[PDB]
Enzyme design. Structure first.
Site, PDB file in Angstrom:
ATOM      1  N   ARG A   1      36.671  45.805  46.795  1.00  0.00           N
ATOM      2  CA  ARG A   1      36.336  46.771  45.751  1.00  0.00           C
ATOM      3  C   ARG A   1      37.550  47.663  45.510  1.00  0.00           C
ATOM      4  O   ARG A   1      38.162  48.139  46.474  1.00  0.00           O
ATOM      5  CB  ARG A   1      35.133  47.678  46.146  1.00  0.00           C
ATOM      6  CG  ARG A   1      33.800  46.983  46.466  1.00  0.00           C
ATOM      7  CD  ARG A   1      33.287  46.128  45.318  1.00  0.00           C
ATOM      8  NE  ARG A   1      33.063  46.928  44.119  1.00  0.00           N
ATOM      9  CZ  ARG A   1      32.891  46.429  42.900  1.00  0.00           C
ATOM     10  NH1 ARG A   1      32.825  45.120  42.691  1.00  0.00           N
ATOM     11  NH2 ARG A   1      32.808  47.262  41.863  1.00  0.00           N
TER      12      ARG A   1
ATOM     13  N   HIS B   1      32.923  38.325  36.727  1.00  0.00           N
ATOM     14  CA  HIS B   1      34.099  37.451  36.822  1.00  0.00           C
ATOM     15  C   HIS B   1      33.765  36.030  36.386  1.00  0.00           C
ATOM     16  O   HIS B   1      33.110  35.288  37.126  1.00  0.00           O
ATOM     17  CB  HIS B   1      34.614  37.413  38.252  1.00  0.00           C
ATOM     18  CG  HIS B   1      35.561  38.513  38.581  1.00  0.00           C
ATOM     19  ND1 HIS B   1      35.139  39.732  39.061  1.00  0.00           N
ATOM     20  CD2 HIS B   1      36.911  38.579  38.513  1.00  0.00           C
ATOM     21  CE1 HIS B   1      36.191  40.504  39.275  1.00  0.00           C
ATOM     22  NE2 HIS B   1      37.278  39.826  38.950  1.00  0.00           N
TER      23      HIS B   1
ATOM     24  N   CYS C   1      41.031  39.078  40.933  1.00  0.00           N
ATOM     25  CA  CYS C   1      41.551  38.930  39.583  1.00  0.00           C
ATOM     26  C   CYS C   1      41.112  40.095  38.703  1.00  0.00           C
ATOM     27  O   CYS C   1      39.944  40.493  38.711  1.00  0.00           O
ATOM     28  CB  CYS C   1      41.070  37.616  38.975  1.00  0.00           C
ATOM     29  SG  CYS C   1      41.663  37.358  37.278  1.00  0.00           S
TER      30      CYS C   1
ATOM     31  N   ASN D   1      25.290  38.060  35.500  1.00  0.00           N
ATOM     32  CA  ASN D   1      26.465  37.986  36.359  1.00  0.00           C
ATOM     33  C   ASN D   1      26.227  37.019  37.520  1.00  0.00           C
ATOM     34  O   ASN D   1      26.924  36.001  37.665  1.00  0.00           O
ATOM     35  CB  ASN D   1      26.755  39.415  36.843  1.00  0.00           C
ATOM     36  CG  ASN D   1      28.047  39.545  37.644  1.00  0.00           C
ATOM     37  OD1 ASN D   1      28.477  38.611  38.307  1.00  0.00           O
ATOM     38  ND2 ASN D   1      28.632  40.745  37.628  1.00  0.00           N
TER      39      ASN D   1
END
Ligand SMILES: [Mg+2]
Ligand SMILES: [Mg+2]
Ligand SMILES: [Zn+2]
Ligand SMILES: [Zn+2]
Ligand SMILES: [Zn+2]
Ligand SMILES: [Zn+2]
Lengths: 162, 162
Positions: free
Chosen positions: A60, A97, A104, A118
């Site tokens: 994080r 993501h 990334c 998600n």
DNA sequence: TTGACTCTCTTAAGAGAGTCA
DNA sequence: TTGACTCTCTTAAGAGAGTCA
């Protein structure tokens, strides 16, 4: 911060910093027996990470800027979406993501959607295997497949029907 | 501790009791535009739930039996699988609702698999829509579909390629 | 031995905020 | 002002264990 100009300036600074992250090529399953290539812009493993970035957990990070002498801070992947609604159907919007690569920060690999949407991409067959996501997946989800179920549905007696 | 014969007796008493739960007929999507029917054996919304059953959370229950003066307790959906391995690939096995109906205790609607496999069924296209689970789904997952993504991948400048 | 409550914990996709230098 | 750490929280698929009569 509050003004649209201030927000665009935050987005522009974030893009400039992340654009200097190392670009790592990842070859990925697309579904349908096909393979593709993604270029992830990966935050470093250890400090320093880049101007404005700090690690708040094993995977994080947060981005912070001082505007009008006040510190404003955001989750490191949320910055591209600061001008978007922060909820949908009463559910919080999350940075998601498409490359399934937490380090990334390439905004071309991120979308903004409910936590359920998600999560569900982890099991998607992929853009060449039947993905139906309106914002299309970039790869087959890493958890797609037959699974490893230990025991299936069963009964010892005769009390149940399907 | 408990012999395999004692375990079978627990499974048998559990099936006897669950078989007397209200049986609710549900019409469900199977994938491929087809509709099917599932028959769920639903634990009551409030006490009493049935012999041996007690609620430990809003949608969590436990089954309890006392054998030779020792109290034994299990998650209410784990009882069908007490004679099975409890882990696979280093992952704990979990009770997984093929009917996606938490109150249901029909063992013909349950399987025993990792938490990741379990979650992933929420997004499966279903047994008539392309399910590849080796232990096949009974219905399309409730969260299957195009999703409700608020914003897709995007950049303001030209710092990134996919 | 049993019922009906109470509490906290796991996982892996995501978050917010404080303490120092 | 900026950097480098610290802590706990959210969600929705799942868990174990205590108290009292
Ligand atoms: Mg994700
Ligand atoms: Mg499930
Ligand atoms: Zn990426
Ligand atoms: Zn998809
Ligand atoms: Zn059911
Ligand atoms: Zn399936």
């Amino acid at each position: 911060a509050l003004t649209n100009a201030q927000i665009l300036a935050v987005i522009d600074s974030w893009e400039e910093t992340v654009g200097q992250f190392p670009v790592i090529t990842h070859h990925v399953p697309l579904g349908g027996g096909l393979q593709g290539t993604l270029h992830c812009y990966e935050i470093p493993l250890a400090a320093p990470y880049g101007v404005g970035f700090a690690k708040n957990g094993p995977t994080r990070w947060q981005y912070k800027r001082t505007i009008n002498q006040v510190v404003h801070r955001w989750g490191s992947h949320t910055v591209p979406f600061l001008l978007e609604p922060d909820n949908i159907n009463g559910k919080t919007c999350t940075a998601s993501h498409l490359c399934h690569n937490t380090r990334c920060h390439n905004p071309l690999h991120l979308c903004w959607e409910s936590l359920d949407d998600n999560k569900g991409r982890n099991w998607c067959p992929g853009p060449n295997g039947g993905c139906v996501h309106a914002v299309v997946c970039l790869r087959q989800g890493p958890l797609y497949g037959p699974g490893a179920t230990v025991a299936g549905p069963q009964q010892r007696g005769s009390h149940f029907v399907v």
